Amino acid sequence: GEELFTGVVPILVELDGDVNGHKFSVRGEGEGDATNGKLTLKFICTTGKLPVPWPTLVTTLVQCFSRYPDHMKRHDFFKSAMPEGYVQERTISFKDDGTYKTRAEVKFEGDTLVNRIELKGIDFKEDGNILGHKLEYNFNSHNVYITADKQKNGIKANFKIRHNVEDGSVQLADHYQQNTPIGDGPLPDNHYLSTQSVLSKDPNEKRDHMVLLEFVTAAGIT
Amino acid sequence: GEELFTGVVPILVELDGDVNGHKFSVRGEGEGDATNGKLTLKFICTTGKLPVPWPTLVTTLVQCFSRYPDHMKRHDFFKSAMPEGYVQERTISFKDDGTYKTRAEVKFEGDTLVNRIELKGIDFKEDGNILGHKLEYNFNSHNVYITADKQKNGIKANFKIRHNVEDGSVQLADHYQQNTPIGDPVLLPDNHYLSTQSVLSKDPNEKRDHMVLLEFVTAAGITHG
Numbered sequence: 001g002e003e004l005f006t007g008v009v010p011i012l013v014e015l016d017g018d019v020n021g022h023k024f025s026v027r028g029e030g031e032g033d034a035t036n037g038k039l040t041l042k043f044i045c046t047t048g049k050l051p052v053p054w055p056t057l058v059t060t061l062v063q064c065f066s067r068y069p070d071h072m073k074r075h076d077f078f079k080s081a082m083p084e085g086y087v088q089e090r091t092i093s094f095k096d097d098g099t100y101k102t103r104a105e106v107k108f109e110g111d112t113l114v115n116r117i118e119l120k121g122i123d124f125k126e127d128g129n130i131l132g133h134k135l136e137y138n139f140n141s142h143n144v145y146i147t148a149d150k151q152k153n154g155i156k157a158n159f160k161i162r163h164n165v166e167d168g169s170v171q172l173a174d175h176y177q178q179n180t181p182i183g184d185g186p187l188p189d190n191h192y193l194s195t196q197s198v199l200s201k202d203p204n205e206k207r208d209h210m211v212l213l214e215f216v217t218a219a220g221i222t
Numbered sequence: 223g224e225e226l227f228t229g230v231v232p233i234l235v236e237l238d239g240d241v242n243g244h245k246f247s248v249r250g251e252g253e254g255d256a257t258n259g260k261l262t263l264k265f266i267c268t269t270g271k272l273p274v275p276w277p278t279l280v281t282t283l284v285q286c287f288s289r290y291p292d293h294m295k296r297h298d299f300f301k302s303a304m305p306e307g308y309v310q311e312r313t314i315s316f317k318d319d320g321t322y323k324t325r326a327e328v329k330f331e332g333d334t335l336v337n338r339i340e341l342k343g344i345d346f347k348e349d350g351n352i353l354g355h356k357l358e359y360n361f362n363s364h365n366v367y368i369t370a371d372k373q374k375n376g377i378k379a380n381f382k383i384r385h386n387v388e389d390g391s392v393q394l395a396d397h398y399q400q401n402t403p404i405g406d407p408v409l410l411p412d413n414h415y416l417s418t419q420s421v422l423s424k425d426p427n428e429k430r431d432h433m434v435l436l437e438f439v440t441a442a443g444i445t446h447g
């Protein structure tokens with residue numbers, strides 16, 4: 001599938017979410033360069049104010065843009081499932097707080113890469129770090145370990161994401177990730193990805209938004 | 223002094239370190255844009271394989287290229303020391319491990335911003351996160367609290383750097399930083415903070431132990447202003 005990702009590919013992300021009843025929608029437009037492992041996107045909240053902090057939606061808001069080095073091309077599941085695409089289902093548990101439950105489809109629609117997502121956050125408490133909006137405008141992770149699930153013909157990943165809290169503490173986010181191809185065609189070994197995220201604001205944007213620049217690279221101590 | 227950083231300024235970094243007896247040198251070339259708070263550099267180890275993981279040297283490998291907002295220009299200590307420059311002394315205590323001790327001079331040689339540092343690390347353990355090289359190739363986002371030292375006509379800062387470890391844990395690096403002008407008039411700031419976001423990458427066309435660093439630093443904390 002590593003064919004349609006040479007050159008720059010336009011990205012559209014659509015998310016419809018519901019956290020504790022608070023229903024919202026986010027639309028992100030941009031473009032990705034898998035050759036350089038580069039993502040340049042801009043998300044806005046189409047419905048109004050975002051009920052959760054932007055960093056909390058980073059993991060949910062296209063791993064098919066990660067740069068796989070030429071000697072690790074056998075590890076690329078994300079590209080392989082294209083243009084048929086894959087389904088990314090996730091469960092994100094926030095320590096001492098609520099839980100995100102996401103289901104998304106990442107596929108090629110025309111010559112534009114699309115990530116369409118349904119999100120259901122429940123049992124979220126306040127003050128907290130999510131509903132109370134006390135997470136800083138940044139993002140830290142790594143390194144994410146991807147395994148193959150040959151029993152479902154997809155991949156499984158489990159990782160811990162630490163969100164920096166404004167007081168100086170740390171908000172834990174346990175990600176349990178499952179990916180399963182839509183079509184049939186394409187099974188990687190134990191490898192890790194290395195995305196690096198930087199968050200900013202559009203000075204000419206008076207709405208709720210997040211400008212995301214990202215650097216994803218595949219690597220492996222094997 | 224701030225008018226020296228309008229536009230793109232070339233940057234030369236030179237780091238000479240000694241960790242547990244292991245001597246090493248790092249040479250960095252790049253350019254910085256203080257208006258956008260952008261910072262592009264490339265560091266190489268000219269003495270061979272780096273004895274320490276790259277992330278631990280990022281904090282020591284030029285805060286005069288940070289983006290200060292229009293209303294906080296009067297609180298920009300770093301640019302006001304230019305072109306004569308400033309001295310930046312640091313003690314970095316790694317929790318349950320050794321300690322870096324650094325002293326740097328950041329000044330304008332010709333039309334080039336040069337950071338010449340001296341590093342000495344002691345009491346590091348071999349099977350630890352640093353000498354055992356257990357740290358992941360990244361760098362977390364941070365918020366530094368910059369305060370004014372009116373007794374040294376300079377500034378003070380103390381912060382916590384979290385380096386990611388391979389086993390899914392965190393290696394804490396406690397930084398103690400003090401910046402002093404030469405004397406020689408400098409702007410002493412009010413209580414404010416810097417926000418830092420870095421990205422480390424490699425050059426595939428380099429066969430030497432290196433680090434390609436991209437960095438975005440912005441200033442905030444003062445209410446208008």
Ligand SMILES: *c1ccc(O)c2ncccc12
Pocket residue numbers: 058059139140141142144159195196197
């Ligand atoms: C997805 C998007 C951005 C990140 O920084 C990231 N880190 C770790 C795992 C997944 C992921």
Ligand SMILES: *c1ccc(O)c2ncccc12
Pocket residue numbers: 280281361362363364365366381383418419420437
């Ligand atoms: C210097 C460079 C990059 C960083 O991320 C950083 N963080 C905190 C203090 C200093 C510093």
Ligand SMILES: [Cs+]
Pocket residue numbers: none
């Ligand atoms: Cs743009």
Ligand SMILES: [Cs+]
Pocket residue numbers: 093094095096097098099
């Ligand atoms: Cs939970």
Ligand SMILES: [Cs+]
Pocket residue numbers: 178
């Ligand atoms: Cs499951």
Ligand SMILES: [Cs+]
Pocket residue numbers: 268269270
């Ligand atoms: Cs040499």
Ligand SMILES: [Cs+]
Pocket residue numbers: 274275276277
């Ligand atoms: Cs290293």
Ligand SMILES: [Cs+]
Pocket residue numbers: 315316317318319320321
């Ligand atoms: Cs120590």
Ligand SMILES: [Cs+]
Pocket residue numbers: 139140196197198361362363419420421
């Ligand atoms: Cs980062």
Ligand SMILES: [Cs+]
Pocket residue numbers: 400
């Ligand atoms: Cs001191």
Ligand SMILES: [Cs+]
Pocket residue numbers: 403404405
């Ligand atoms: Cs002096």
